[PDB]
Design a protein around this ligand. Structure first.
Ligand SMILES: O=c1[nH]c(=O)c2c([nH]1)n(C[C@@H](O)[C@H](O)[C@H](O)CO)c(=O)n2CCCCCCOP(=O)(O)O
Ligand SMILES: O=c1[nH]c(=O)c2c([nH]1)n(C[C@@H](O)[C@H](O)[C@H](O)CO)c(=O)n2CCCCCCOP(=O)(O)O
Ligand SMILES: O=c1[nH]c(=O)c2c([nH]1)n(C[C@@H](O)[C@H](O)[C@H](O)CO)c(=O)n2CCCCCCOP(=O)(O)O
Ligand SMILES: O=c1[nH]c(=O)c2c([nH]1)n(C[C@@H](O)[C@H](O)[C@H](O)CO)c(=O)n2CCCCCCOP(=O)(O)O
Ligand SMILES: O=c1[nH]c(=O)c2c([nH]1)n(C[C@@H](O)[C@H](O)[C@H](O)CO)c(=O)n2CCCCCCOP(=O)(O)O
Ligand SMILES: [K+]
Ligand SMILES: [K+]
Ligand SMILES: [K+]
Ligand SMILES: [K+]
Ligand SMILES: [K+]
Ligand SMILES: [K+]
Ligand SMILES: [K+]
Ligand SMILES: [K+]
Ligand SMILES: [K+]
Ligand SMILES: [K+]
Lengths: 146, 147, 146, 147, 147
């Protein structure tokens, strides 16, 4: 995957978990021969789609990272709704894989357990990056070449 | 800092007291960041927000939407919020402009008051939303074509 | 609001309540100096969006009126889904306020109490028309003149 | 009169008996209104309806969609109806054509049978849908450009 | 006789064993109908399916999407399936091409195994989906411009 151009956009709300998710992505990136991907930070998950759109004009793959944790109001339902609609629309507009690595949990423990910390069960940041790079390679093979 | 960004704010009037609080938080954050006079527009209901944000988006770098939707005894609550989500998301991607979401969606009136930024409130959504808009505008300015 | 061009589309399903909703709209219209708005009737709520699209090509505001009452099947949930998606799409395509005055209730008493009959608690038909007319005047001021 | 309207009908085959009832109601209303031979097309599933309605919309004044979706033991039921709702609504607005919705969505098989228009049924969705299509087509005819 | 149709198949690999079953059913139906060598492409996850089907639709008369999504302990399950629904429906209408839906969405792993077409399964969604795509392609060919 030494030829693919990777971009990473991650939200800052719940900073510790974000650092873990971002850490997993960079490791997979380096393993596959990409030492310096484009990394961009935003304040909230709702702001992810609009920044991915801009990143898509100059990259072969985009990875979105973040954490949304449920509260006491139905607001949780509407934050995740926007993210779903936004990223799906961007991918098909630009014909570019926009990998989904945004956690959506019921509690804080659940999110911590899926971020890739020392004693976590899983690492969504790594899974997402492997998904982006592989889909980019496939599209390269399918499309016009010589 | 953000002295060069062009900000617009659209807020609904249904439940007027809370609207004033939300609007008050936004303006303070705006003044703190060096923007003394943003474009402010009022509407009658939440459903009317998206169509006014679309117009504001052709002359501004960031738009902030403010309002409160409180649940009743019918499934009507669910359909008001559905429209707002679909509308704002579509506007942002059509115009490539951050449309910050500061519309409260609560079970009770107490919950809404506690998230508006009154003297004894736990948080202030109007302030968070404005900080979200201004920062995303600055990022897009850096990523985009410059000299 | 004597310069605004208003149009009203109302469904016939549950005829009595429709008449009330339509009655409230016309009164507010006359009060604001508009003596004869464009009035169009349809058979069902699903048919509203496609008629509002046509009305939007020569009016500054459109008001949609109707009643959907829940039954014994999940059908209720899908009629309201279509109406929400349709009206939202029309408003943004045409840059025109499409006021929502479609009742969505659990019982028949609930709908009667929100229609503007002699002993009703509120009148959605009047609220919706006030919403349309005001939004049209705002857009008029924001836009290009003179 | 409706004798000038060009009608098209697309119906799925999943649960064949009920489909025949739904289709039978539509044709009767069609003949009553002076249209003896509408365009009838069959598909295998409800998900396949939207893409066939799009094609039919390029040379008809009205399209009627007929079918039955019955709930199972998984959340799958929720996702089949979601697609149908999204698809049909998008098609009607793209083509400015009434796409009448006559797709049943029930909890049990009894419920579906009771709404199809069989000898002892409480109502007939196939008939209601066709009356909805033909009337909306006539209205659009009157509103639009004529001489 | 579907010997003239150009078929493409895109399948996710998450839960590999079930994927192989789903893929196995599709290819058998394919061979039965006289198509010995369809285009087969693998992806890592279900969210990646829509974007690959869009590319495949530029060169084929039908696309079949295959995969399994199993519910967990968080509301995440709800948002994975929402994306797939919106994506596939959009692609089909953009390209005027049948994109058959063969993506399982279950509560437990037993339920998924039971619907994949293994020795002792109750049904095979991979086979049903391919039959749906090839039939819809033939119908569209008949409706459209021919000599
Ligand atoms: O990544 C996030 N993760 C989050 O968990 C998050 C974010 N972002 N934002 C704000 C952003 O979505 C966005 O910046 C704002 O909406 C501004 O437009 C939130 O308000 N949240 C809080 C989630 C809502 C649920 C908790 C609120 O408490 P309540 O439900 O009891 O009222
Ligand atoms: O304004 C309405 N209000 C309505 O309440 C309505 C309407 N319209 N239509 C039909 C129309 O939406 C439309 O004309 C048809 O679907 C044709 O496309 C309905 O079938 N309804 C009834 C809604 C179904 C729920 C009540 C029946 O009980 P059930 O749950 O057993 O089906
Ligand atoms: O910002 C809002 N906040 C609101 O709380 C609101 C709004 N708007 N609208 C209506 C407007 O959004 C809109 O202008 C109208 O639909 C007319 O187009 C409402 O009817 N509401 C009332 C809340 C929705 C229903 C809950 C009230 O109790 P009910 O269930 O008995 O109707
Ligand atoms: O018209 C229909 N009517 C239907 O009732 C139907 C259809 N179609 N399809 C399949 C079609 O939607 C479509 O052909 C396929 O998805 C292939 O794309 C179904 O699976 N069904 C069955 C209803 C889905 C809900 C039950 C799912 O099974 P389970 O929840 O018991 O596991
Ligand atoms: O085909 C699949 N089938 C699947 O079942 C699947 C997939 N894919 N992906 C991830 C992919 O959809 C995709 O690669 C990612 O979204 C990255 O873009 C998943 O996370 N899953 C699992 C679904 C939920 C993930 C975690 C399990 O639920 P829990 O967190 O509630 O315990
Ligand atoms: K690209
Ligand atoms: K090639
Ligand atoms: K702008
Ligand atoms: K630059
Ligand atoms: K207009
Ligand atoms: K002006
Ligand atoms: K037509
Ligand atoms: K005319
Ligand atoms: K094609
Ligand atoms: K032909």
């Amino acid at each position: 995957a030494s030829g693919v151009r990777l971009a990473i956009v991650a939200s800052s709300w719940h900073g510790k978990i974000c650092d873990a998710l971002l850490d997993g992505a960079r490791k997979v990136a380096a393993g596959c021969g990409l030492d310096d991907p484009t990394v961009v930070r935003v304040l909230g998950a709702i702001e992810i789609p609009v920044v991915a759109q801009e990143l898509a004009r100059n990259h072969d793959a985009v990875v979105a990272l973040g954490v949304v944790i449920r509260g006491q109001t139905p607001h949780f339902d509407y934050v995740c709704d926007a993210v779903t609609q936004g990223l799906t629309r961007v991918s098909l507009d630009s014909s570019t894989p926009i990998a989904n690595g945004v956690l959506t949990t019921n509690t804080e423990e659940q999110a911590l357990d899926r971020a890739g910390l020392p004693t976590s069960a899983e690492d969504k940041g790594a899974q997402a990056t492997v998904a982006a790079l592989a889909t980019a390679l496939t599209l390269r093979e399918l499309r016009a070449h010589s």
